[PDB]
Amino acid sequence: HHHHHHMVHITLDRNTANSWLIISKDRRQVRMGDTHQNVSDNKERFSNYPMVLGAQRFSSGKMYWEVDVTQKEAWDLGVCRDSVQRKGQFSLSPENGFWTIWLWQDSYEAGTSPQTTLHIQVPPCQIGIFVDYEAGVVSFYNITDHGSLIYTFSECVFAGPLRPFFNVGFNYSGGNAAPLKLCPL
Template sequence: MLLTWKDPCVYCDEKCSVLGLEGITSGRWYWEVKIENELHSKWTLGVCRKDVRRKGNYLESPQRGFWVMGKVNKSYFALTNPQTWLSSMQDLFRVGVFLDYSEGDVSFYNMIDGSHIFSFPPASFSGALFPYLMIMYGAVSMTVCSMESGSEGLPVPLNNFPPLEETLSTPMEGFSSGCGVDGAPPEAESLLLP
């Protein structure tokens, strides 16, 4: 799945977000998000419950069903209560997201150097969780990459997403639309819920 905001000059109270199509209710999951963004941008990624509010100006926190980390301009953060500012680090271009549903673990990794970024305190999940991407402003592109095998020393996926990338289709100005995946298996379904 791919989410792209094209206009780096647009700032607004609206957020654009997408969810994975199928919910996660058990097991250990791992995927990576490729990120391309300019300096002045704001985005988050992680997991959320399906029933969360995602219209208008909403807040992301574990208390509201979001376990996410992100970037605003030059700074990285985890949306805890209160917000946790992450130590100064290199720009993130590929983030690994690890979810262990039964252990209540949501963790993030910098896949350029394999370092740990942040782990939320263990949570007690109820209901399905979905991969989540959000862009608020800036020229940003985020792509969820399916993982066939894990890297040595890092979380290993026990379940995999189908090998599919898709572009968000939306009538809102400033977003790309269309899709196309060469060689995707016929049984693969879209990973997006608008």
């Protein structure tokens, strides 16, 4: 690709975070805590899953950012509608306002309904996420493998402002404590 020049500075929005997440002072890293993080509940917080949104809202243009996933067993990344459901159980699908990929149990999948098998030869340590609002496109790139394409959602129906979306995953195994980190430009 050649999308790096639409690079945007993403930061995490503490107020949207699940109450077990720990966001770094610079708002560029997030990890699962071993307990509730002593914050009040609010209507923005994802209740059921270890999710958090970026602070930035996008309604036009082309946007690109990169996320470090080093040594994680499980995660979800992409974008979502600002109006996605926060409370209770839900599936990650474009019908529910999410454009995502994930790692789960040694397989990578795109958040279609039903989910789509990805073919990645080089397990990624960093993921690039590209959004073209006007074109209706969300694309994912393997930064570890010279920027190779992972997946493209096209004909997307955003139907409102978009926010960067993150899921650090549960850590039942003790092997998924590592953070998600927004990578420098």
